[PDB]
Structure 1
Amino acid sequence: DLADLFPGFGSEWINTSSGRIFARVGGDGPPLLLLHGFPQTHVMWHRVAPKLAERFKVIVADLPGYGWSDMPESDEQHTPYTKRAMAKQLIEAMEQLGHVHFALAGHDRGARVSYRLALDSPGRLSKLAVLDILPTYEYWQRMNRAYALKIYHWSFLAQPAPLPENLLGGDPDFYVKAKLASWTRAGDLSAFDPRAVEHYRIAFADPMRRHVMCEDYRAGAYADFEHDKIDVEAGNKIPVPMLALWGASGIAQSAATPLDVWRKWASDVQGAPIESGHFLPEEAPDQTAEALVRFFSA
């Protein structure tokens, strides 16, 4: 029993060469793809998507391997869960809808897909919004004691299988709720809709889903970093107009200033802090939706 948090939205099973993407689709107008992160699903957008759907064709997709999207078989390089592969799959997904040029907002892992998409295929994007991330390269390059402790899961989940999978299995309900709570401003689950939490908890209860998330983070430690590094070293910048939103107490702000980081990565970036923890669309949906509406409309 899982709640429908996007009333009026259709539900699309969208075929790609690497498996189906699940998406809620609502609204009309320019296509806007919304990509969730860890440890969530598309439903994390449930408070923001209705206001975006007032002006956009909003496609709220489960990342490859997440939520209800199919799980491509991974390989030794975790290729299907590299942000490059995920980006290609989502591009293919959008093409199945006739969307070859779209707006894109990603949060967390989906924001990593998003900026990698913008680096690999900038022509696909009219505008890009990333929510509470710095590029994966930057996390790994600023890796120090403080960051290692704060984003320990970047190294923990990247451990070779089945070490994180076995440990996650030790208490999956606790773990997913722990991540959700610990990354909010409040430090508990009160910022979330309980029915959304149920979606995340059921997704996290599936061992195969958890393995995918580890594959995502293994990619994030290896191929994703290597891909980002190539762009840093080649000076490749995102040419799409982009909005960087970060929580005042989110993952990205401490020990940086995300805008001055993203300016290294994008030619044309606007940014603003949102009074929120990591889960901007759920902890501060009105502020997040307003900034997204404003940035994507004109």
Structure 2
Amino acid sequence: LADLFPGFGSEWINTSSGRIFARVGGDGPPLLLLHGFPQTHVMWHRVAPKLAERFKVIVADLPGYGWSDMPESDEQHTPYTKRAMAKQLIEAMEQLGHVHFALAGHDRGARVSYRLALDSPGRLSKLAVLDILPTYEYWQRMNRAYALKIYHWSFLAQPAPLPENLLGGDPDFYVKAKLASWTRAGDLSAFDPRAVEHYRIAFADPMRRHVMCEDYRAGAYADFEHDKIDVEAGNKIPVPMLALWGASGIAQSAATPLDVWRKWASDVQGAPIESGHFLPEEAPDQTAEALVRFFSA
């Protein structure tokens, strides 16, 4: 597997729920980058160098993803709820001495991020979320059109071992299909093939696939419940936040992203980027510029 972060260190961060793998590079204020599904921390490899010019950039595999340890799940999918993941990453950052940090997340990692910001806003200086709306909003917008677009939200949340069993016949196909289907071009051309091999290898592990289903199961249940509480309580993220979404990404299919994020966040700015879902790989320069600008003041 290729090293896509030349000069970045490698950290195995112990937490109470398992080790968090991260690449660490740069200097300056700490910036935690969180990938999503079906990816690993390497999806940041095209923007993290630019960030590392200005920030101490920690590029972490989510709990259960990549090379992070996989906590055993339970009937409530607890370790794969974003609340739990957020607590675990808070612990990881504390192990590095980062109790107040900037956070950019993509996809599942963005869900961890905004849940972190709701649960533990004091930990964040600024938050960027890439190509998501809150989990509650996706579910609340789950009509025919969206159920077809993000069918995987309900498919991967089916009780084990149904998606696991189907995924296991040809894991390569599914990970490549999801990477391709959510890009602007509809193929794998936006990705570095070395990055794709990282994603594919991670997906080849039946336990990693199970974790991904657990993440989606949490996404269908506890994550939704946690968001529902906040949205019904009018809890808003108080951390200044950037919502970036791809013009051809997933978030803009459900709804206009800034309008939605303004319901969740008291201090949100937003920008579309001409890109499919995978902003940092499809549009690394625009993404990296957006993030540097936002986190730089």
* Common fold by TM > 0.5: yes
- Count of matched residue pairs: 297
Q: Does the 8 Å contact 2:138/2:254 carry over to 1?
A: no
In structure 1, distance between residues paired with 2:266 and 2:48: 27
In structure 2, distance between residues paired with 1:248 and 1:198: 26
Q: C-alpha offsets along residues 115-160 of structure 1, whole Å, 9 cap, x if unaligned? A: 0000000000000000000000000000000000000000000000
**CA positional deviation for 1:220:** 0.1
Q: Which residue of 2 aligns with 1:135?
A: 134
In structure 1, distance between residues paired with 2:151 and 2:159: 15
Q: C-alpha offsets along residues 35-55 of structure 1, whole Å, 9 cap, x if unaligned? A: 000000000000000000000
Q: C-alpha offsets along residues 80-99 of structure 1, whole Å, 9 cap, x if unaligned? A: 00000000000000000000
Secondary structure (helix, strand or coil) at the match of 1:254 reads helix
In structure 1, distance between residues paired with 2:263 and 2:131: 16
In structure 1, distance between residues paired with 2:285 and 2:275: 11
Q: C-alpha offsets along residues 225-259 of structure 1, whole Å, 9 cap, x if unaligned? A: 00000001110000000000000000000241100
**CA positional deviation for 1:171:** 1.4
In structure 2, distance between residues paired with 1:74 and 1:183: 28
Q: Which residue of 2 aligns with 1:150?
A: 149
In structure 1, distance between residues paired with 2:284 and 2:2: 19
Q: Does the 8 Å contact 2:12/2:21 carry over to 1?
A: yes
Q: Aligned-residue CA RMSD in angstroms?
A: 0.4
Secondary structure (helix, strand or coil) at the match of 1:195 reads helix
Structure 1, 153-162 or 253-262: larger mean CA deviation:
253-262
Q: TM-score, structure 1 length as denominator?
A: 0.99
Secondary structure (helix, strand or coil) at the match of 1:89 reads helix
In structure 2, distance between residues paired with 1:187 and 1:153: 17
Give 5+ residue unaligned stretches, structure 2. none
In structure 2, distance between residues paired with 1:172 and 1:254: 27
In structure 2, distance between residues paired with 1:250 and 1:87: 24
Q: C-alpha offsets along residues 265-295 of structure 1, whole Å, 9 cap, x if unaligned? A: 0000000000000000000000000000000
In structure 1, distance between residues paired with 2:254 and 2:10: 40
In structure 1, distance between residues paired with 2:199 and 2:275: 19
In structure 2, distance between residues paired with 1:225 and 1:182: 25
Identity of aligned residues (%): 100
Q: TM-score, structure 2 length as denominator?
A: 1.00
Q: Which residue of 2 aligns with 1:29?
A: 28
In structure 2, distance between residues paired with 1:155 and 1:66: 20
Secondary structure (helix, strand or coil) at the match of 1:208 reads helix
Structure 1, 243-252 or 253-262: larger mean CA deviation:
253-262
Q: Does the 8 Å contact 2:13/2:21 carry over to 1?
A: yes
In structure 2, distance between residues paired with 1:30 and 1:261: 29
Q: C-alpha offsets along residues 188-227 of structure 1, whole Å, 9 cap, x if unaligned? A: 0000000000000000000000000000000000000000
Q: Which residue of 1 aligns with 2:63?
A: 64
**CA positional deviation for 1:170:** 1.6
In structure 2, distance between residues paired with 1:23 and 1:14: 8
Secondary structure (helix, strand or coil) at the match of 1:154 reads helix
In structure 2, distance between residues paired with 1:293 and 1:43: 18
Structure 1, 238-247 or 251-260: larger mean CA deviation:
251-260
Q: C-alpha offsets along residues 161-200 of structure 1, whole Å, 9 cap, x if unaligned? A: 0000000002100000000000000100000000000000
Secondary structure (helix, strand or coil) at the match of 1:24 reads strand
In structure 1, distance between residues paired with 2:228 and 2:186: 33
In structure 1, distance between residues paired with 2:189 and 2:42: 16
The equivalences for 1:8-157 within 5 A come to 8-157=7-156
Q: Which residue of 1 aligns with 2:170?
A: 171
